[PDB]
From a paper:
Enterovirus 71 (EV71) and coxsackievirus A16 (CVA16) are subgroup A human enteroviruses (HEVA), small, nonenveloped single-stranded RNA (ssRNA) viruses whose protective capsid mediates cell entry and humoral immune responses. The external portion of the icosahedral capsid comprises 60 copies of viral proteins VP1, -2, and -3 arranged with pseudo T=3 symmetry, while their N-terminal extensions and 60 copies of VP4 line the interior, surrounding the RNA genome. There is a “canyon” (a depression encircling the 5-fold axes) on the surface of enteroviruses that often harbors the receptor binding site, and there is a fatty acid binding site below the canyon base, within the hydrophobic β-barrel core of VP1. Here, we remedy this with high resolution X-ray structures of both mature and natural empty CVA16 particles and also of empty recombinant viruslike particles of CVA16 produced in insect cells, a potential vaccine antigen.
The sedimentation coefficients and λ260/λ280 absorbance ratios were ∼160S and 1.67 for the mature virus, and ∼80S and 0.64 for the empty particle, indicating that the latter does not contain RNA, and SDS-PAGE showed that VP0 is not cleaved into VP4 and VP2 in the empty particle. Diffraction data for inactivated CVA16 empty and full virus particles to 2.7- and 2.65-Å resolution, respectively, were collected at room temperature in situ. The crystals of both mature and empty particles belong to the same space group, P41212, with similar unit cell dimensions of a = b = 491 Å and c = 709 Å. The most significant differences are on the outer surface, including the BC loop and C-terminal residues 280 to 297 of VP1 and, in VP3, residues 58 to 66 leading to the B strand and the C-terminal residues 233 to 239. The inner surface of the CVA16 particle is similar to that of EV71 and distinct from those of other known enteroviruses: VP1 starts adjacent to the icosahedral 2-fold axis underneath the αA helix of VP2 and folds across the protomer, while residues 12 to 31 of VP4 form a loose spiral beneath VP1. VP1 contains a bound pocket factor, modeled as sphingosine (similar to EV71).
Author numbering:
A (entry chain C), B (entry chain C): 1 to 242
C (entry chain C): 1 to 49
D (entry chain C): 147 to 194
E (entry chain B): 10 to 254
F (entry chain D), G (entry chain D): 12 to 69
H (entry chain A): 2 to 8, 18 to 297
I (entry chain A): 51 to 149
J (entry chain A): 150 to 198
The structure:
Amino acid sequence: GIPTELKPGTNQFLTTDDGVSAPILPGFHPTPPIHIPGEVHNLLEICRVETILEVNNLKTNETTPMQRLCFPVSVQSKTGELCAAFRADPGRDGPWQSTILGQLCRYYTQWSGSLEVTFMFAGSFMATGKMLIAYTPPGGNVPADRITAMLGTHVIWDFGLQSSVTLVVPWISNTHYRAHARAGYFDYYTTGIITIWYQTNYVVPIGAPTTAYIVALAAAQDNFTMKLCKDTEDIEQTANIQ
Amino acid sequence: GIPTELKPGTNQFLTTDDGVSAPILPGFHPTPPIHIPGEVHNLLEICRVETILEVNNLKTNETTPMQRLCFPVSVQSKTGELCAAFRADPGRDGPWQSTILGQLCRYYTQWSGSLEVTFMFAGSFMATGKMLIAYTPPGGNVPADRITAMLGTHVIWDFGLQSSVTLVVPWISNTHYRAHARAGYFDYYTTGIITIWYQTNYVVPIGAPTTAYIVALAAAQDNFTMKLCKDTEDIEQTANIQ
Amino acid sequence: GIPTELKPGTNQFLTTDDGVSAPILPGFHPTPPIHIPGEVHNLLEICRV
Amino acid sequence: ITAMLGTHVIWDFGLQSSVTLVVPWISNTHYRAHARAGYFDYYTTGII
Amino acid sequence: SDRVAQLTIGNSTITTQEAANIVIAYGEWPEYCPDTDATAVDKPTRPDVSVNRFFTLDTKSWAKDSKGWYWKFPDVLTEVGVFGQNAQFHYLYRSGFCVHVQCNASKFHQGALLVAVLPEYVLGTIAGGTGNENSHPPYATTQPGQVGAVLTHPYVLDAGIPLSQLTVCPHQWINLRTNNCATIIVPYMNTVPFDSALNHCNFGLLVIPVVPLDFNTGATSEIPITVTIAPMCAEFAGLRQAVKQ
Amino acid sequence: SHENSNSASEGSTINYTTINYYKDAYAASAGRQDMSQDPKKFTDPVMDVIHEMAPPLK
Amino acid sequence: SHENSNSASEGSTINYTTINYYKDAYAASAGRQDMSQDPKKFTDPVMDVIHEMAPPLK
Amino acid sequence: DPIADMIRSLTALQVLPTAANTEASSHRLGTGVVPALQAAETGASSNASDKNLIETRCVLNHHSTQETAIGNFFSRAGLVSIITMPTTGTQNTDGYVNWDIDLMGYAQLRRKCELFTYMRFDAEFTFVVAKPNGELVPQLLQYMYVPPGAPKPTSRDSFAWQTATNPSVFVKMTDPPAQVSVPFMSPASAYQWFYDGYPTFGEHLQANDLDYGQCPNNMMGTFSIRTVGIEKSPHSITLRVYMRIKHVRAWIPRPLRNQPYLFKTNPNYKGNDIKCTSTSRDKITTL
Amino acid sequence: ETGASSNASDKNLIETRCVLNHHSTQETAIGNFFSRAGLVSIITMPTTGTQNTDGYVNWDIDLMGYAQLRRKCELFTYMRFDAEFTFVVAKPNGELVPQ
Amino acid sequence: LLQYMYVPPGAPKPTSRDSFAWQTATNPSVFVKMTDPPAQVSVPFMSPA
Ligand SMILES: CCCCCCCCCCCCC/C=C\[C@H](O)[C@H](N)CO
Ligand SMILES: CCCCCCCCCCCCC/C=C\[C@H](O)[C@H](N)CO
Ligand SMILES: [Cl-]
Ligand SMILES: [Cl-]
Ligand SMILES: [Cl-]
Ligand SMILES: [Cl-]
Ligand SMILES: [Cl-]
Ligand SMILES: [Cl-]
Ligand SMILES: [Cl-]
Ligand SMILES: [Cl-]
Ligand SMILES: [Cl-]
Ligand SMILES: [Cl-]
Ligand SMILES: [K+]
Ligand SMILES: [K+]
Ligand SMILES: [K+]
Ligand SMILES: [K+]
Ligand code: NA
């Protein structure tokens, strides 16, 4: 017979090895395929789709979860008030976990790219207002006041026929890729902080609600990619599935 | 020697693996072949051949099995009477089990195609009559009366010099293939019901039998195919063969 | 199967053997390289210093 | 839910103050005589 | 010129002066089943205008505390007009749909409905609360008919999945300050070319108030929501007697 | 390798795309099966060929 | 070796550079994955195409 | 001729091996153009990109998109079943086991598949067997596939093990793990993880509401296993089955499961303890 | 009576649509039906008893002792073929020893 | 019989000999016997730098 020599690795079963295995049904032919709408080829196709961000993820909401899908704005009495804040880290525990983007990138160890958060105002047509939305890259904790937040990347949103506005969280990192950030050494990969401030005020005339809500949708932009496929922390077989 | 590495599957014996094994008799030459009529190449060649359907599969017949090979028609006193009924499911227990088609498709898990049942009238030459044969696709149990059965696919047969007529059970399924139907979740794959009714009446003059029989032959049409080879339930080694 | 015959050396692990081993992450792509001053290719480059 | 099965238009109030319902000629005869209770109800056009 | 629109099919026409475009699910228009994909051999019946037209179902009332509703297709129409009759007399059915959900208020009301289409909307039960009981939804819940049903736990769509991600499906929003309707065109989606209109619901239509309705007292409080749907390219096969289920 | 022609199926090879490393052909694998058929010898073995148009008995 | 075309992915092969030693295609490896995408069907399934320049509602 | 009345997809595929580049942009000050403003009501996601909201530099991005191709996401062997044949107890002192093929018993793989509504693929099954404590002994086993309708063995020596037509594998617990390729076998064009319907016609009385969601097109039969011998084997056996999807296609993405799984055959969830998709905090204004 | 099977097809009995059928006929080729290893014999050499405490056994080759394979072959009157024989051996309880 | 598994940063670490994490549906795992030769694999360059 032909001279061979077994090398290390012999007999091992590597779950990700892409090899050839003998076929159990010789000459078998599958049912032909038919056309079905909605075929996907790459997870990135999905990551570009906006899904709802749970900015209002309060402990007091847990029993009325629906209230987590949108946060409020209302007639202010003082100027420059902070409306809401949250981290931009998409693979981190928090608001992003509710998005399909967040869930999917948790199946990968690293990511790279610019993100996009679109805010839709759901108040009455008679309500007007201007908000300042800011992205503060790494380094400074939550800006203390609007005048400090204003120094970062931001958008000044005006309510009108266009119900929504888009804040861009441009990829501003030192490394080409970021691993998922979390407290500790890995905070090195944090993306930053998003803050929403009252630029002027929520104004409404007599006859309309003095409080309204905003829905936040988030997704990835075209330069987004992920790498190093891994298992997600977000699912557990706590007990046997019967 | 050449660097190799054993992969999973090593040493296994897969009964359907189509490999090469060393020859025990080197230089051996078989007896030459000679011409023999009747060579077959594909089971489908056989499935197209009509064989007898046991429509009259009664518990009271079991001891006089020959009586199962044909069912009767006779002078009716009432109009629109039902003559016989049975499922079209070919791989199911019942009338089809007596056909070579039924037996063979039991060696496969799935099938697809149109079937064909040909009825031969064996009464006297002086007997006349018209029957309505219907195929009721999935959904409705056995039609209660001829006027309901009439709404499905059917053929109105007239007795004459042409002793027989052919009912076509066209392939009308949702899936491209059907697995063998049986009570339970798999009833999803049932083919349907065949019913035979008196369109007019079996009429005969003085001097001829008032009861006669019909033989039913069944087979597959040209669009018939089977897939996923498997073992048949129809044979068992109840005890040792000596 | 193809006739083979194991030769001596079979199953051994030689620390300096330069072979091929199965990849654990199929389709994985490394972070691109960037330019960094001071690349060395041969120890002799250093011995001359 | 029964009326909905006939010829209809779903009108939305807005800057366009009006909407037009068309009563298409759907008759058996080429012409209709004036309908009124009795044999002549045969020529009725229908209901809006 | 994107806010105004007219939909005319069969002997029916819909108008709207506050639209927000139209969605074509997964970018595909409905179409009759082609000979390459088909398998059933009988020539189908394609009734055209008697079934591809707009049908308006029962109206629902939106309250400051509504949880949300859903309807299953083609269940909603199995007993309406000529479409239902064809669905009953045939084993096989196939079609697409034009879904038009209506809801208008005033420039002083507020709220936002998420209107989505979810293919193969399989429902789950709360498992006896504790999760030790393997209970299942009753026919009336899986196939609510033309009246539709109410979600008990919208946050998980009564199916253990996050409402927050439903936008990954064909959808539109009816945000009172912006538009008063949603329109989605849905193509046939299934693993088989034709199927039973009775045993299998291809998709579900969900209408959930994600941003609750609100208004100052004195303003009209009856804010209905109406669903009007039209089958498109309806095809039927496997004729026999009528079956309701 | 060019072999001895001793396979059981060579008069009219029901196979034709086999694999082999030995000098004897019968050691070869089964190969891909061909799709030839001739159902007529079983379904219509009649002398005057009866058409599916006129009555089979005239 | 030239095989039987029975792979699950052949209508529009999501793969295309596979390895195989058996007569049945489905036994083949997964191969190198292609990088085709069509995000528009999910991100912009609207009739009049809204530009990123003017306001999406005119 | 004498009767006149008797007489598509706007989006397709592109190859994107790398992430999009960033073109350099400068300041834009003017009326009419307003890319930052959107209308999420349309159902479309925002079309705005970095260059429209800020001043950008040029970036030649070479990041690959290959690892997120569904093929690389799924073609990783995962556990789909654990079968045990103990020697003492109420389990299976019979020396054989018949397992109904259902892969929805383990969450990791299940959640990944349920990201889609329909999937079509081939699969590589690997069978890892050992004693319950991980030790190995010279035991001969036989694994057999019994498609729907084939006689299931009723004993360690039932005639069914003659396996004249069904495919069987004979392997030792000491040999490496057995491994085979399986084709796409549904009578449908694709396996479907969600079937909003019933398998048969009829009234759907609460007695048979367990029928709901059961799609026969996914029922692949039985997987049987036994120690090969007429006499009982003295060893308890633990068989772990791994599946690796290959040659895959997928349709219609859906929200990912966010409540623990309770049953193999349905999406039932524990109603008294409905988990929030995201962790919580005290104030919306504080991290 | 002629001995022929019916020549009628769907299009003659009903109105049909066009169907481009791609269902394969390959799996029913006799080669794929038969080329699947099946049990044809079980031979035993026990150490105690009246069986074969001799350490050897002579078996007359006859493959008709097991039904599954036999019924398949008997579907035909004559068959010509080559064969691959596999010999699976172990102790009666399935254990293996260096013999 | 042993199982070696790679748990990238962020992946759930097994907490017991039978933690669900060993289902290894996405992480790469190697199953080998102490009697087989030594397992061997190739690893790519994985830093985000
Ligand atoms: C000799 C080794 C035989 C191995 C045979 C394994 C066949 C398994 C085929 C995989 C089928 C995919 C799973 C299909 C459906 C899901 O389990 C459903 N949820 C069950 O209801
Ligand atoms: C070293 C290994 C030797 C293996 C030799 C096995 C030779 C067996 C040849 C197969 C012959 C086909 C069976 C022929 C006839 C049937 O058994 C008859 N029914 C017996 O009367
Ligand atoms: Cl040699
Ligand atoms: Cl992150
Ligand atoms: Cl050598
Ligand atoms: Cl059947
Ligand atoms: Cl071989
Ligand atoms: Cl809720
Ligand atoms: Cl073949
Ligand atoms: Cl790849
Ligand atoms: Cl045995
Ligand atoms: Cl485990
Ligand atoms: K292998
Ligand atoms: K061999
Ligand atoms: K190696
Ligand atoms: K690029
Ligand atoms: Na814009």
